[PDB]
Design an enzyme around this catalytic site. Structure first.
Site, mmCIF file in Angstrom:
data_model
loop_
_atom_site.group_PDB
_atom_site.id
_atom_site.type_symbol
_atom_site.label_atom_id
_atom_site.label_comp_id
_atom_site.label_asym_id
_atom_site.label_seq_id
_atom_site.Cartn_x
_atom_site.Cartn_y
_atom_site.Cartn_z
ATOM 1 N N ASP D 138 0.791 -1.228 0.000
ATOM 2 C CA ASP D 138 0.000 0.000 0.000
ATOM 3 C C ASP D 138 0.817 1.268 0.000
ATOM 4 O O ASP D 138 0.628 2.209 -0.787
ATOM 5 C CB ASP D 138 -0.660 0.072 1.359
ATOM 6 N N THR D 139 1.720 1.285 0.962
ATOM 7 C CA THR D 139 2.583 2.420 1.128
ATOM 8 C C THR D 139 3.781 1.830 1.853
ATOM 9 O O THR D 139 3.778 0.670 2.161
ATOM 10 C CB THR D 139 1.814 3.416 1.949
ATOM 11 N N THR D 142 4.381 0.435 7.059
ATOM 12 C CA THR D 142 4.310 -0.869 7.674
ATOM 13 C C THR D 142 5.547 -1.776 7.430
ATOM 14 O O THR D 142 6.254 -2.211 8.342
ATOM 15 C CB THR D 142 2.854 -1.382 7.782
ATOM 16 N N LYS D 166 0.834 -1.399 -7.949
ATOM 17 C CA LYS D 166 0.200 -0.266 -8.586
ATOM 18 C C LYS D 166 1.016 0.879 -9.148
ATOM 19 O O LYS D 166 1.963 1.303 -8.570
ATOM 20 C CB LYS D 166 -0.867 0.285 -7.703
ATOM 21 N N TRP D 187 -9.293 0.997 -7.912
ATOM 22 C CA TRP D 187 -9.789 0.366 -6.677
ATOM 23 C C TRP D 187 -10.282 -1.027 -7.061
ATOM 24 O O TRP D 187 -11.146 -1.179 -7.935
ATOM 25 C CB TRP D 187 -10.844 1.266 -6.008
ATOM 26 N N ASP D 194 -10.630 -6.658 -0.114
ATOM 27 C CA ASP D 194 -11.974 -6.311 0.325
ATOM 28 C C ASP D 194 -12.229 -4.830 0.268
ATOM 29 O O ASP D 194 -11.318 -4.031 0.062
ATOM 30 C CB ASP D 194 -12.154 -6.713 1.775
#
Ligand SMILES: [Mg+2]
Ligand SMILES: [Mg+2]
Ligand SMILES: [Mg+2]
Ligand SMILES: [Mg+2]
Lengths: 215, 215, 227, 219
Positions: D138-139, D142, D166, D187, D194
């Site tokens: 995602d980024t 984390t 992405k 998206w 989910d």
């Protein structure tokens, strides 16, 4: 029955646009066809997902009724096989009772089709399956003989359908895909008896073609 | 080669002790087979387990050499089908390269064998495949027809072999299980084109029996 | 006050599982065993294909009972992995082929975690905000229930939130000495008291990836215990 | 210590992922969509099938680069489940059919929760080959934060596998060592992706529609 080879009110196959493919680099190609397949058109998995729907189409269609499926032997070996696996399972999870088997297999060979006694289909549901009808004269000639015994229905399931402009233009009532008329090997499609065991419906190399032409 | 139907090299089949079954009831049995079955000889999952094993054994025996597997049509779909699947897959994850396909497929129907123009197997390695082999008036006959073309190899692969009081009865080289002399249906095992689509292999019932004709 | 969740780990009204007679075993030589296990596996308890065929049926049962309503399944991490996996796969697939109407998904997965030679059986199940199970049907999946301590403990902890119904599914139940124990609601096989390994059963983190449930051999115990 | 451990998040010397051109979708129609997702899925990005086929090639890849050496695979909870599980399935198998003997299991699984990772003692990893698994990075937070922690115990190596990747503007991020697809910034939901805990069980990777969005939270 007059409608046959016409696809009267089928649901249109999935449209695969011209010049659209996948790189085999991206898949695990087995060492032996390795150096022959440059482009994948239909991945093995896409075929199975699509075929799963097809089965469903068919299942909802002859549900609660005896269905007699015929494998034009040689080439129909993959699809028909996927197909029967899915119907079987579908009916098993269905929970709608039916006191009849999901289908009845029958085999035939070829070019004209060669079969035993067709008297078995009188007043029955006839589903003939193929990998593809590149001519359908053979399908038309066999369909003729099939007519005479007065079967209940007669449809055609086909994996692929080439938008061409050179044929007898026969069409199935259950089509997986609609494709560019290009040359395809794999997924039971073959060159000179070669590539049937590859999992992906691939586009045939100028290289595959040489080696598999002569020396 | 003089060893055909003899079972000489052969690793012994999974041995299934006498009178051993499982209740159909604790399996998921498609509604149209419910009234019929009661005892299960082999769970299809046990059979996919064994066959995976035979695939390996076979893969091990023909690695890097061309292999022509003839499927005795109608009754060997199950087994044959489950076999090339593995065969091919094993070839793919072996990373031990070969310029040869996992197998070459062939179909012969028909209690004699309704042939093909079998000259092609002139020095090939041939494995004949059967679901079971109760007698020999065919297996032995086609073996002779073959023999004449001096194929390089001859072997049979059978899913099942009932323990029996007969003689000069063929033995497999790649055998699935050893079961007692009982009446089994399902997993391609027939009963008037009956119970083919059922997953497992069931012992049949007088019940199943009764119902199945015109009475 | 929340309504009291009746029987729990009683096993009330369940369908008994496949019964596997004592000393019933297949021989490892008869199946394909990978090299890392080869030297340690001789007897096979349940051939991995056998347990698939079996969980296919369990899932069918689970479907028939919660179809149409939200079903929240809790996977007790590490152990319950394979079994759980097999189950949601069947679950959703059956849901998908049933051609029988429902606006709710097959399940909603949830994950949690947690004696031997010197210690204690206080594997305490740990999880997040349980409050999300209020008025929910919950299904706790275990690979086997061996002490019922941890499930009785968690059990209590979940009853406080008032879930709508709270059942347990376990892959195998061992026939052994005891009473005063949790019994699962949906269970696959009844087996004798033997030390298993494989198909997500482990021996000090070993064997999980073996595809069949086998018996622990003296060589495995040796080769793999505490040195 | 050749082919380092300071390259983590760099995706250095990787094999570029499968490239999925912009505006390339399949019609949901052509698939069997479950009743409960039927009105929400209009378009398909990656057919669950294409996914297994890509993962098969990732599994081989991961196999070749770790054969005969213990591999420890950390699955990141809820999110990386489907992908993780397709992995270890193929891994197990490919090794079972290799005919090249290893005297070591194909992997050792471990799970982590979540945004910070929730690990337990990482000591278990000193000297280990560690492969981390994500549905997507995602980024960077984390992972980087976690990579720091991991590196403290000195693994023998640390690599990242991610299904999807992405094409984004914000790039000052983690790049994966083993990644499935290269996609458009859209998206997606399904095959473990989910939308507010919706559509994880769907088989294919679909694009998040407005109906389903408009409907699954803030009404
Ligand atoms: Mg044809
Ligand atoms: Mg036969
Ligand atoms: Mg446990
Ligand atoms: Mg994630």
């Amino acid at each position: 029955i007059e409608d046959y080879g016409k696809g009267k009110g089928r649901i249109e196959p999935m449209y695969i646009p011209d010049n659209t493919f996948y790189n085999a680099d991206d898949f695990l190609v087995p060492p032996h066809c390795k150096p022959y397949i440059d482009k994948i058109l239909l991945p093995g998995g896409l075929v199975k997902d699509r075929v799963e729907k097809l089965a469903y189409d068919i299942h909802r269609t002859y549900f609660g009724e005896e269905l007699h499926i015929i494998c034009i032997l040689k080439g129909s070996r993959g699809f028909f096989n996927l197909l029967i696996d899915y119907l079987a399972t579908i009916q098993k999870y269905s929970g709608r009772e039916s006191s009849v088997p999901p289908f009845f297999e029958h085999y035939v060979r070829l070019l004209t089709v060669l079969s035993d006694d067709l008297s078995i289909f009188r007043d029955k549901h006839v589903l003939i399956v193929e990998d593809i009808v590149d001519t359908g004269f053979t399908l038309t000639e066999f369909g003729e003989r099939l007519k005479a015994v007065g079967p209940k229905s007669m449809r055609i399931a086909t994996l692929v359908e080439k938008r061409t402009d050179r044929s007898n233009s026969l069409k199935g009532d259950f089509v997986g895909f609609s494709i560019e008329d290009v040359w395809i090997v794999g997924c039971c499609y073959d060159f000179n008896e070669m590539f049937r065991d590859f999992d992906h419906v691939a586009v045939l190399s100028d290289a595959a073609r040489k080696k598999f032409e002569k020396v």
